[model samples]
Target: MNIFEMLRIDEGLRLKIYKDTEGYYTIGIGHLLTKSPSLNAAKSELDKAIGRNTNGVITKDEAEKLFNQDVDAAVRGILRNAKLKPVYDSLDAVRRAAAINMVFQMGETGVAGFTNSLRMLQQKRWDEAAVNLAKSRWYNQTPNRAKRVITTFRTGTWDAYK
Candidate 1:
């Protein structure tokens, strides 16, 4: 259930500027902006999610907690929407964990982009699926992080990065 590696893969280390899918200002592992809610003050939610008046800077510890919360929901969403409970349950922990990571990184729809890879996985073709994953734009964009994930997919070991 450890999400540290997945968080690093998607968010990377340190704070940076980025726009999310709908072009809202985002930082710190997919945190998004929204109109002030009736329950909270304006931008108070951002301050709570990132840090108090740190000007977009967030510590790794804070990011980890955010990742923990978000990834938990992502996993549940995958379970519900994908309706692959039996398939997910049959996978080894490494595969299951990596699936959760992919869900976090791509969402269910984006993950469907890996059609060949997902089919390979469904077929239990570990090596082929790893190769398929390596051939993706996600892999091309984040080779180092993808290498860790691909290795885990192929070998089922938690090869923690240094």
Candidate 2:
């Protein structure tokens, strides 16, 4: 499938509200409901996406469709971030997805925090890039997803999405 489809597995999916690992209210494919500056605005946004309202629940299609916008923000965030633009776009589609996947979950700034890893990536130092990431709290917090993404970095293939 495409990058979006490849990302779906890492975040998983839920049609109803639930607490994430960090105890924040999240739903759909890892949408941090609590991160919205205005929780009420987040509510209305989901409601609008649902085509009316949701009583703490959303349709599968609605969640998938709505999540697309979040993914786009990650995409745009990567392409425009002055520090990341060059190294970011130089990657192959699979390697780029690995980067985008990180941004999708962690936000561009969060991934940008990996200066050494980004440098290794920019230099096409695959294993070193993966190694730099392996030492992060993100790796500690979610080893399962982290492993797959790291493997993509080291291998330059979509097999990790499997």
lDDT of each: 0.67, 0.83
Instruction: Put down candidate 1 lDDT per residue, 1-162, tens digits, no spaces.
Output: 356655665566435434554444555676544433322332455576665865555676776677678878877877786545545676887778878777776677777577788777877899998988998887887677678778777777776543
Q: After superposition, how far is residue 161 of candidate 2 from its true place, in Å?
A: 2.7
True-vs-predicted CA distance for residue 85, candidate 1, Å: 3.8
Per-model TM-score versus the true fold: 0.69, 0.89
Whole-model alpha-carbon lDDT for candidate 1: 0.67
Off by over 4 Å in 2: 35-45, 48-51
TM-score of 2: 0.89
TM-score of 1: 0.69
Error of 1 at 95 (Å): 1.6
- Over the stretch 90-152, how does candidate 2's per-residue lDDT look in tens digits? 898888888888898888889889888888999998988888889999999989889999999
Query: 71, model 2: CA deviation in Å?
Result: 1.3
